[PDB]
Structure formats: structure tokens, C-alpha cells
């Protein structure tokens, strides 16, 4: 049946090429021989066997077989290399996680080429992203690695979230010890720069806000190479962490350690005065310092900016194609 994973062979896919370096193995683009569908194959190598099958992949299998949403990448099946005949020990062949193939990744679209993003293109994009995050958050899962590269986009305008390698369940009743360094520094929230270690779903919201701002400038907002420098840049814009705005900042391991140059005032609305009013209010709420005052995904979908966006009208992002080839 369709559910008997791990047996079908990768012979059933014609490999087209390597689309990326993954965490646990290379990622390939391929075509299904029987249907003609294009798929993406994340290769899982346990030949190292330091700890066997990687947990990063285990998380993505455990979670993406539970999560079904238009904005969540779909894992179609798991296939294997030709296994050694009649030996269960000499087999070092790898497994492949079969996903739908997405045309582009957001990092690629922005870093290279001028992709134009109008207000409506951003509305359709953010609405899909945040709606997916709300599906995951209602299911009590935290992505924990929201970057531009992990947001995938088909030319049809459909958005799908992708790399669930660092995702784990969140219990509001039972606070649990977590791994502090989780999101990439450019998209990391302040509480995790100060080492909360018991983080809330609000961490994902901060990242999506950094993206929201990035879509209006085509440049990431907080570009820093060190944990402290990020907190300074965040502080120059959002204001310095202080009990005045974040009563529980004093409980965080590094609050006294990582002080910014000044006790800056919040300028977010000033340095982003060129953004539409509905959007600026969304950015201001998403980039709130105190994670308990930072809005939830559901609240973002119930915002003047996204509330009335009709998902049926996909509104694809503007792609140059032929015109860009020769200036």
C-alpha cells in the first residue's frame, strides 16, 4: 500500500541534479519514472553511524507525517538504495525523504535578481506563511529555524515552509529545558540572544517579522555576525531590553552581561515610515521585545493587513524572466 514506507527503491526516480547541501545529506531534484512528477530527495546517510539515523531527520519524519496544510511542505514517501541482498548488517545504503519539488527558495529569489514585491504580493506571501505557522502552533510544534532559505515558493505563488529539522513540541503546562542557540543569528529573537532556554512559540513570530521587514527593503533587518552585535542592532531599532518594557528580562541569564551601548528608544515606526500603515502595525507587534507581549500567529491573521486578504487570488511575485536576460 501507499503507507509501506522505506521499501520502494530510489530506482523509481530519475535524478536530475543536486539542489542543495542539507544538514544530514545532499538534497536532489528528481523525476518520478512512473508519474513524471518532479520531487526533491533529502538523502539520509547513516553510514557514519556515530549515533545511527540522525535525529534531525527523525524530527522531520515524525512531524511532517502529522502536519497537513497548504503552506507546509509535504513528505511524500521514504525510499532506499538497493539494499544488500540477504544481508541486514553489510547494508550501508541510505534512505531518501521524498518531498514535492518547489521551484525556488526565498533566499535565492532575493539574494540574486531583483524580484519585485508589491504590497499585494507581500500580503499573499505573509498570509500563507503565518497561516501555516498557526496550523503548526495550534498543533503545539515550534519550527525554531525560520530563515529566508527555508521558505519555499512555487511560481504559482504558493508558499510552503520546509526545514523542520530543529522542530520540537511545546508544552505550556510543563516548562521544559531547551537548546538555547536555535534560530540563525540574523533571524534570532532577543530572548534567545539572552539565553531564555525555555522559549515560547513567539520565537517563530519574531523571525517572520524580520522577514516582513526584509520584504519591504529587499535587505535583512538585523545583519550581525556575533550574538552581541545583533542585540545592538535590534536595540537601535526596537529599544533596549529593560524591565520598563519586558518585566521578566531580569530573569534571563545574560541580561546584565549583554548590555547595549545605550538604553535606546524605539524607532521602529520612524526608520520604517515608508511602509504601509497596516503593515507597520504588524511589524511593530511582531518585533515586540517581550515574548509575552509579542502577538501570536492567529492575531497576525486577524490584522488589518492580512484579515481581508483573499487567499484564492494567489497574486504571484513578479518574476522578470526574458527581459532580465539582457539589460
Amino acid at each position: 500500500t501507499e503507507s509501506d514506507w522505506g521499501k520502494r527503491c530510489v530506482d523509481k526516480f530519475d535524478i536530475i541534479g543536486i539542489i542543495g547541501e542539507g544538514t544530514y545529506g545532499q538534497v536532489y531534484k528528481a523525476k518520478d519514472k512512473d508519474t513524471g512528477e518532479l520531487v526533491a530527495l533529502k538523502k539520509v546517510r547513516l553510514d557514519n553511524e556515530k549515533e545511527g539515523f540522525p535525529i534531525t531527520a527523525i524530527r522531520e519524519i515524525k512531524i511532517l507525517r502529522q502536519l497537513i496544510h497548504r503552506s507546509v511542505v509535504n513528505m511524500k514517501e521514504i525510499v532506499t538504495d538497493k539494499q544488500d541482498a540477504l544481508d541486514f548488517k553489510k547494508d550501508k545504503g541510505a534512505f531518501y525523504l521524498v518531498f514535492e519539488y518547489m521551484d525556488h527558495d526565498l533566499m535565492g529569489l532575493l539574494e540574486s535578481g531583483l524580484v519585485h514585491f508589491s504590497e499585494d504580493h507581500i500580503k499573499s506571501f505573509m498570509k500563507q506563511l503565518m497561516e501555516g505557522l498557526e496550523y503548526c502552533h495550534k498543533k503545539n510544534f515550534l519550527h525554531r529555524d525560520i530563515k529566508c532559505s527555508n521558505i519555499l515558493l512555487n511560481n504559482s505563488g504558493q508558499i510552503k515552509l520546509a526545514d523542520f529539522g530543529l522542530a520540537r513540541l511545546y508544552n505550556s503546562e510543563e516548562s521544559r529545558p531547551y537548546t538555547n542557540k536555535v534560530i540563525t543569528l540574523w533571524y534570532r529573537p532577543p530572548e534567545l540572544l539572552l539565553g531564555e532556554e525555555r522559549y515560547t512559540p513567539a520565537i517563530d513570530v519574531w523571525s517572520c517579522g524580520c522577514i516582513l521587514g526584509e520584504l519591504f527593503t529587499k535587505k535583512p533587518i538585523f545583519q550581525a555576525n556575533l550574538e552581541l552585535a545583533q542585540l545592538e542592532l535590534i536595540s537601535r531599532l526596537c529599544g533596549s531590553p529593560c524591565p520598563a518594557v519586558w518585566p521578566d528580562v531580569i530573569r534571563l541569564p545574560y541580561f546584565n552581561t549583554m548590555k547595549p551601548k545605550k538604553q535606546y528608544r524605539r524607532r521602529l515606526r520612524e526608520e520604517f515610515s515608508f511602509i504601509p500603515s497596516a503593515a507597520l502595525d504588524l511589524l511593530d507587534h511582531m518585533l515586540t521585545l517581550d515574548p509575552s507581549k509579542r502577538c501570536t500567529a492567529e492575531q497576525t491573521l486577524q490584522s488589518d493587513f492580512l484579515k481581508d486578504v483573499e487567499l484564492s487570488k494567489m497574486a504571484p511575485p513578479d518574476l522578470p524572466h526574458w527581459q532580465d536576460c539582457h539589460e
Partner: protein, 826 residues
């Protein structure tokens, strides 16, 4: 790992802006010409221009304006670089010693902002109270021109109108006033604001807003007695001042878009206008004096003067002389006469300043069997289009071959003692239903001519409508003699067929030498072309013969000969064809893992693929199996403009951000994951847009080579006409030259006090990295021009490594010898 060297062989020639004023002395009339990164200072004479000084700046010159603050004897110069390096400059001359003073400097970049569609705009107040900068949508930056602002500190005023087209400071206003055309969904409007240095905000502007032409392009500030502004469009010219409103809509300007303006009479009575087809107009302000003793604008008139080169900037000098600054063709001095000549023209060319224009493509060919090599470029666009023959002889000798249509690709076929050149010319839909060319050109003045009769695409179920007056490109293959550069033959391609790629080669066991062209069916409706042809031609006995045609499902962006087989890129696909004994193309194998396969290069059985957004790829042909293999990719995404192979492991690329990079095979072969990663070992901000890489050298190296430390030779052409050269170094030579750069940067004084390290840092809107793996040979070659005291300061404590002697101190005379050998590679 890889270490490379990059020098300029020919400086940027395209004129990017030009101003006049009193910069060198309060008495002289100056003409300042800006080419990319280069400033030329001239003095106006009765015969022409007397050059006086030329400097380089560590930045692309974006804004250039002359202003004279109160208390200054002579004009000062403001410049802002494309990396937002701002400075105020002064000319100072002490007898024979000419130097440029940096009076104020700083970087005006904002941590947050959206770069505007119409680019950086810089304007200065008539009263010189402030400098205005439009860098980001929704923001207006003000640098007050106060004596204390030596760092050029500035503030932003929130601007409601997000999409601004153009802005100028208005003359004849009580307070500093800006007039700008902006676009919102209701069309384009003209609006004015007043700028307040005390309040640091806008106040309501002096006169009413209006809704203007949809394609309103430029704002002209008219001085008193008139005041107000003139708004130039595609169809109409309008003048607004308070409640006064005029509009002239002469049919002549509708034919061609107007792009540049300049004031002739300081009182505003007369202005010059130029359009994309090169026509030069006179805009006249007809005065009427009232009983109040007041002067009002009565009417506007437009008069055609003649034809000039397609001008990016105009500047009237004195008497009848105008300087025509062209980015697409040669710049000029032209004289405007009061009386027309017998042809009806008032314009007569005086001088012609060479501009290699946009270099769309080029090849190196030894026309005379000398071993020296000559460079044949596709240069210019539209009527300024031309071929250029370039050889070393101490200056470059350049022959020009006018074409009067856009050249696209060039390739040399020795067997036929001629070149093949792809070209496109503009025709306009005429009342016959067909089209009419605006002027004759190479593809129409060919000795013999032909037109494709291919029936492949004749099966068009959907037709395409045409409106009178619309432009179309007509593409041709030109056959051009290598001694006379006579157009021997012109082949016209199908209607709506674009010629994109061209090669000359033999295939398979076929002894004939062919011209092969790759095309694309371009319909306005299609974002990406979906039809195309590979056509095999033979030039024989003065006639081009259609030999075979292969239909493809896309655009043939690039082709190249590959060990007797034809390698072509069709959209995402990279295909290898074999040439049968039946003289037809047969597919052997394909590669589909691309977005758009824009550029191809080969060496042996290896292929380098340049992609639209996915940087570079290393493909390999595996003859044992008859297919392709992926050796490695550059997963760091970049928008490619051209690619080249340096050696079996290093690969060179050019970015649309004016950056150069080198990728290598990781050569740490433990895991397939490492082998398949091309690592970007080289990063370098060039400052030019590279269209074409081409192996070769113009130097006499046939037995006259002696020996150079540099190994290899790649030439490249750019949009601004600049030609450069890239070459490789040994680890030892790089370290020496690099260590010397850091010493030279401390010694050499930069114009505007721009850090050299900043200038050459890799730079996109999203990233800025320090340069690596590249020696700025133009910095190294400046060691020979610095005074003796500075040379010895540079060599102090300088040691050599990995040589005959492991540690060896350098003297000033030792480095003069090394650099002079490095100047002999070009």
C-alpha cells in the same frame, strides 16, 4: 586558495554625466566629465577643450554637481558614490603642482531603506543652503551646507509620496523649495514642498499640485525672471508657476523619448533637449513684459536643430559649442549655427571623442599573422552601433566600423577571411501593415542578402496584433570581410525571431566550416520564449546557404563547439548534439537542472554553465556512457552576466552587482558532499558590468614574451566601454603584491578620503564582504607614480617569501622593476 590579478587595459569611456562651472579658478570656464569612477577636468577655449587634470575615485560617480558657497572664490565639487560615499572637493594649484582637496567627507548610507526605482538623485539649493538626496523610497535626506559640517552629517524627512520620478530645487523662491513629479495609482502629479533646516521637516509648498502626463520624466528648474518649473514627457512639455499653466504638444517629440536637458541662456529663455534617436531640439521661452515691469512666460516653442549622438548628458559651453556626452556612442563637440546648412541642419560636428560604448561581445583574432592579436568588439547601440578593431601600439590604436544598428554577437571564421556578426535594427509599424526602418544600416546595405524562409513556426494558431507606430527588432546575420570590413552578406531572420548565439566551427566528420546561429521566437505575451531554432549556414562564394535547421522548445541563449559536437543551452536545458553524415543535428544527451542556462564555456570534456540566479555549475561529458555528469555547483546564489574558465580547477564569474568572483573544486576529496561544492575562493568588486570574457592578449607575445610572473590571460568587456584583464599568480607573488597593497593604501591619498578596502569590498544590496583572492593591479601600477619619499616609505620593512632567498628585504628600486614588468602584460 586561488590567487589572481586584475588590471585595466582601457579606462571607462562612456560619459555618465557632465557639468560646467568655475571649478579650477573663479575665472576659467570648466567642463567636468564623469566616466565611471573617472573624473576629467577640462578648460573651455575658443577651439575646444584644454585638459588640465584627471583623477580616479574609489567609487562609481553617481552625483556630480558644482556649487559655490557664499564666501568662496570659486565653485566647489560635490560627488556621491554608488556605495553612498559623499565628499566635497576643491581644486588647488601651486605653480606646476595640481592637487584635489577633500574638504568634507562621509558615508550617507541608512541602516534601513528601500532603494528607489529612479535611482540616486542629487540636487543643491540655488542659495547653497543644503544638499538634497533621494536615496530611498519615502525618504528625503538633507545635508546642510554649513561650515562646520566637515563630516557631512544629515537627517531624513518623512516623505509621503513614495514613488518619486524626479526632483529639483526651484529657483526664485522665498524659502528652499523642491519640485517633484511623483507616481501613485491615480497617475503622475507635480507637487511642491518647502524644506526647513530649523524644523527639519517639510512645510506646505508654494504652489498648487496638478496631475501631469502619465510618462512625465524630467524636472527643469527655470531661473528668474520666470521661476517655476518645466515638466518634460513623451508627448507634452508643460510649465507650471503658481496659477500659471502652459502646455505645448508638438508631434515631433512623440516620435522619440526625450532623455536629457540643459540650460543655454542663464535667464532661462532657451534650453536644449535630446531624445533617444539622437535628435537635438531647442526649447524656447517666449517672454512678455507687463506694465508692472514684470516678466511673464508667454508661450513655449520647440525647434529641431539637427542630429547628435544619442546623448546621456548635454552641456552648453560657450558661443555655439555644445558638449554631447554619450553613454551608447561617441561623445562630441558640435557647433550650433544660426543659419542652417543646405540640408536644413543647424548642427555641425567639431570633434569626436572615442567611446567603446556597450561591449555586447568581442573576440580576439590575429588578422595580420603577427602573433600580437587584435581585439574586435561589438560596441555601441542603435545608430551608434559599430565594430572596433583594437591593437597595442604607448597608446591603443582603434579602427571604427560604423553599423548604424545594434551588434549582438561576433565570431571569426578564418576559412572565409571574414567575421560573422549578429545585429538587430529598429523598424516601426507603418501604414502598409509591414514596417519601415528609421534609417539604412549594415543589414540593409549588404552586397548580397537573404531571408529565412523556414516553415517550422508557420503553424501559428494564435496571431499577434500590431499597432501603427510600435517598434520591432529585426535580427540579421552579417558576413563582414576581415580586411575591408565590407558587409558582404546580410541574412534576415524570421519575423519576431531574435538571434542570441553564434559560433563558427566544423562538426563531426564534416569538413565544411559553418556559421551556426541560435534563435528564440519572442512574442510580447511570453514571459519566457517557448520556440527557437538552431540554424546551420554555410558562407560560400559570396552567398550564405541554409544547410539545416533544428527546432527547439525555447531560446538558444548560448552555444559552443565541443570536440566536434554542438553544445547548446535551451532555457533550463543544456544539450549536446551530434552532426550526422546526413548533415542534420541529432541529440545525444541533456542536462535539465537549471533555471536559465544563460552562459556556456568548455575546456576538454568539462563544461561551465552560467545560470540566471544559481551562480555557476561544473558539468562533465562522460564519453564512456554518452551523457552528462554534475561535478560541482556554487550553491551561493548570484545573478550572472558572464563566465569564464581559468584552469581545470578555477572558474571566473561576473555578477550583475558589478562584482567578480572565482570558484574552485574543493580538492578535499573525502565525501561526495565536499567534492560537489565549488567554494568561492575569490571575491572582488570591479565596478563595471562585464558582458563578455575572452581568452587572449593584445601584447606582442610571439617570442617577445621574455617572462612575466603572471600566468594566463583573460580579457573582458563592460557596458561603460572599460576593457580589463585577469591573470593568475603564484601564492608567493600574491602575498608580495597583497602586502604591498596594504602599504600603498596607507601612503596614497584617496579623493574623497574613500577607503580603498571599502571600495573593492564585494557589494550587493544584501551583502558586503571584504575582497579576497584578487590584486588590484591598478593600485599596484600606481606605485610607479608616487613621489620618491612615498616609495621608500612603502618598502620599509618589506620582506619576500618562498624565493631563492627565503627572507629578502625590498628597496624602492626593486619594486619599480617588478611593477614595470607587470605593466607589460597590457
Amino acid at each position: 586558495m586561488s590567487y589572481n590579478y586584475v588590471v585595466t587595459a582601457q579606462k571607462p569611456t562612456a560619459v555618465n554625466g557632465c557639468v560646467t562651472g568655475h571649478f579650477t579658478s573663479a575665472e576659467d570656464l570648466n567642463l567636468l566629465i564623469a566616466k565611471n569612477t573617472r573624473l576629467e577636468i577640462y578648460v573651455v577655449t575658443a577651439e575646444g577643450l584644454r585638459p588640465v587634470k584627471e583623477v580616479g575615485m574609489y567609487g562609481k560617480i553617481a552625483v556630480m554637481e558644482l556649487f559655490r558657497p557664499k564666501g568662496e572664490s570659486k565653485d566647489l565639487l560635490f560627488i556621491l558614490t554608488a556605495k553612498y560615499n559623499a565628499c566635497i572637493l576643491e581644486y588647488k594649484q601651486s605653480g606646476e603642482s595640481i592637487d584635489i582637496i577633500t574638504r568634507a567627507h562621509g558615508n550617507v548610507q541608512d541602516r534601513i531603506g528601500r532603494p528607489s526605482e529612479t535611482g540616486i538623485i542629487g540636487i543643491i539649493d540655488p542659495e547653497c543652503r543644503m544638499i538634497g538626496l533621494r536615496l530611498y523610497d519615502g525618504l528625503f535626506k538633507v545635508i546642510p551646507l554649513d561650515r562646520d559640517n566637515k563630516e557631512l552629517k544629515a537627517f531624513n524627512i518623512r516623505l509621503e509620496e513614495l514613488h518619486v520620478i524626479d526632483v529639483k530645487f526651484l529657483y526664485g523662491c522665498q524659502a528652499p523649495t523642491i519640485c517633484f513629479v511623483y507616481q501613485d495609482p491615480q497617475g503622475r502629479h507635480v507637487k511642491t514642498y518647502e524644506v526647513s533646516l530649523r524644523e527639519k521637516e517639510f512645510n506646505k509648498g508654494p504652489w498648487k499640485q496638478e496631475n501631469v502626463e502619465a510618462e512625465a520624466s524630467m524636472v527643469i528648474a527655470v531661473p528668474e525672471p520666470f521661476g517655476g518649473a518645466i515638466i518634460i514627457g513623451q508627448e507634452s512639455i508643460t510649465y507650471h508657476n503658481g496659477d500659471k499653466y502652459l502646455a505645448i504638444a508638438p508631434p515631433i517629440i512623440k516620435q522619440s523619448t526625450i532623455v536629457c536637458h540643459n540650460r543655454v541662456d542663464p535667464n532661462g529663455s532657451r534650453y536644449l533637449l535630446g531624445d533617444m534617436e539622437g535628435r537635438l531640439f531647442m526649447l524656447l521661452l517666449e517672454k512678455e513684459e507687463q506694465m508692472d515691469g514684470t516678466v511673464t512666460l508667454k508661450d513655449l516653442r520647440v525647434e529641431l536643430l539637427g542630429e547628435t549622438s544619442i546623448a546621456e548628458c548635454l552641456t552648453y559651453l560657450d558661443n555655439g559649442v555644445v558638449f554631447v556626452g554619450s553613454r551608447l556612442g561617441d561623445s562630441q563637440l558640435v557647433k550650433l549655427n544660426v543659419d542652417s546648412n543646405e540640408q536644413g541642419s543647424y548642427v555641425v560636428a567639431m570633434e569626436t571623442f572615442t567611446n567603446l560604448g556597450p561591449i555586447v561581445d568581442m573576440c580576439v583574432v590575429d588578422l595580420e599573422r603577427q602573433g600580437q592579436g587584435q581585439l574586435v568588439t561589438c560596441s555601441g547601440a542603435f545608430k551608434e552601433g559599430s565594430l572596433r578593431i583594437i591593437r597595442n601600439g604607448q597608446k591603443l590604436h582603434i579602427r571604427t566600423v560604423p553599423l548604424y544598428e545594434s551588434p549582438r554577437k561576433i565570431c571569426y571564421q578564418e576559412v572565409s577571411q571574414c567575421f560573422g556578426v549578429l545585429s538587430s535594427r529598429i523598424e516601426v509599424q507603418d501604414t502598409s501593415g509591414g514596417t519601415t526602418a528609421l534609417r539604412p544600416s549594415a543589414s540593409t546595405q549588404a552586397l548580397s542578402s537573404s531571408v529565412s524562409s523556414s516553415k517550422l513556426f508557420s503553424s501559428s494558431t494564435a496571431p499577434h496584433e500590431t499597432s501603427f507606430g510600435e517598434e520591432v527588432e529585426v535580427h540579421n546575420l552579417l558576413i563582414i570581410d576581415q580586411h575591408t570590413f565590407e558587409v558582404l552578406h546580410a541574412h534576415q531572420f524570421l519575423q519576431n525571431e531574435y538571434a542570441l548565439s553564434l559560433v563558427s566551427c566544423k562538426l563531426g566528420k564534416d569538413p565544411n566550416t559553418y556559421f551556426i546561429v541560435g534563435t528564440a521566437m519572442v512574442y510580447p505575451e511570453e514571459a519566457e520564449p517557448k520556440q527557437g531554432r538552431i540554424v546551420v549556414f554555410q558562407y560560400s562564394d559570396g552567398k550564405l546557404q541554409t544547410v539545416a535547421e533544428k527546432e527547439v522548445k525555447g531560446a538558444v541563449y548560448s552555444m559552443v563547439e565541443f570536440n566536434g559536437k554542438l553544445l547548446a543551452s535551451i532555457n533550463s536545458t543544456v544539450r549536446l548534439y551530434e552532426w550526422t553524415t546526413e548533415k542534420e543535428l541529432r541529440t545525444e544527451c541533456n542536462h535539465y537542472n537549471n533555471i536559465m542556462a544563460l552562459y556556456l564555456k568548455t575546456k576538454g570534456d568539462f563544461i561551465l554553465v552560467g545560470d540566471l540566479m544559481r551562480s555557476v555549475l561544473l558539468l562533465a561529458y562522460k564519453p564512456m556512457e554518452g551523457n552528462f555528469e554534475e561535478i560541482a555547483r556554487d550553491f551561493n546564489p548570484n545573478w550572472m552576466s558572464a563566465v569564464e574558465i581559468l584552469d581545470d580547477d578555477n572558474f571566473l564569474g561576473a555578477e550583475n552587482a558589478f562584482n567578480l568572483f572565482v570558484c574552485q573544486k574543493d580538492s578535499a576529496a573525502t565525501t561526495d558532499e565536499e567534492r560537489q561544492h565549488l567554494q568561492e575562493v575569490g571575491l572582488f568588486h570591479l565596478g563595471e558590468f562585464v558582458n563578455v570574457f575572452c581568452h587572449g592578449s593584445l601584447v606582442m607575445q610571439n617570442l617577445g614574451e621574455t617572462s612575466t610572473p603572471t600566468q594566463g590571460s583573460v580579457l573582458f568587456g563592460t557596458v561603460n566601454g572599460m576593457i580589463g584583464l585577469v591573470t593568475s599568480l603564484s601564492e608567493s607573488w600574491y602575498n608580495l603584491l597583497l602586502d604591498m597593497q596594504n602599504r600603498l593604501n596607507k601612503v596614497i591619498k584617496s579623493v574623497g578620503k574613500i577607503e580603498h578596502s571599502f571600495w573593492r569590498s564585494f557589494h550587493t544590496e544584501r551583502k558586503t564582504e571584504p575582497a579576497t583572492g584578487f590584486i588590484d593591479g591598478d593600485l599596484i601600477e600606481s606605485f610607479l607614480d608616487i613621489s620618491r619619499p612615498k616609495m621608500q616609505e612603502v618598502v620599509a620593512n618589506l620582506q619576500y617569501d618562498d624565493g631563492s632567498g627565503m627572507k629578502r628585504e625590498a628597496t624602492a628600486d626593486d619594486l619599480i622593476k617588478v611593477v614595470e614588468e607587470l605593466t607589460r602584460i597590457h
